[PDB]
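call fold target=Polyphenol oxidase
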Amino acid sequence: PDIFQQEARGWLRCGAPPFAGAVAGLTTKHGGESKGPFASLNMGLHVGDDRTDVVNNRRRLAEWLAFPLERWVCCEQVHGADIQKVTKSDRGNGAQDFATAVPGVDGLYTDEAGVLLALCFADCVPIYFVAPSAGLVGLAHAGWRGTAGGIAGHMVWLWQTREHIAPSDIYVAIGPAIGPCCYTVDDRVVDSLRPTLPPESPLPWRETSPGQYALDLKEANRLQLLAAGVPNSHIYVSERCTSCEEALFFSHRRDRGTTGRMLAFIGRRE
Ligand SMILES: [Zn+2]
Ligand SMILES: [Zn+2]
């Protein structure tokens, strides 16, 4: 069974055992207030939807999780590889007004309880991190650009060098994202990813016609995490494709660029 399992409402819980001490999951597209291409549980404030509808969708998740919206922390998600540590003093940033989101970063982490890290997705890879003994949680957004920038390994490096956590103490869930079944890219994308993988590494793409590659970004990020020292048995990977599973997910690719966003979230209850 997939590591992300359907709950009673419009969300999937991360069921990997090391995440049992955390509130961790990904929303699905149903149960909200938004309309048209955003129907209905659009969590993204940056996609041209009605802000009142989106805030109400966020308040609905907050009720399902018993984790108030005033305790969430969001980031700008610029498709880079930068990451910021956040604390209770950052609560609310980007929760109801996109302009207050943490600027210039694509991942967040915290060692405090009572802080819900909250990032938006509709094909890019959500990477959830936990160090259960040390009380750290993290969440990163990795499309091809962030993966080429090594965002996954950057989280591990920060936890090692700034938080004094060995990679062997980290566990990771790679959530629903677009699969190689649906994601075809050109030489420039794969050429950007090549230097981020070990020289002996199997390549997470297949050339399906000249200059066209079926790309597996989940696997690219898993390989980077392995190279950064996270143990194989600590990395859980969802098999759900956001483009294929149209009944559950918004997909930037399938929906031709105008669609909602799911929210990936992780935090610990205070
Ligand atoms: Zn993205
Ligand atoms: Zn697919």
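return ok
Residues 179, 181-182, 241, 243-244 surround zinc ion (ligand 2) (CB under 6 Å). The domain at 1-270 is CATH 3.60.140.10 (CNF1/YfiH-like putative cysteine hydrolases).
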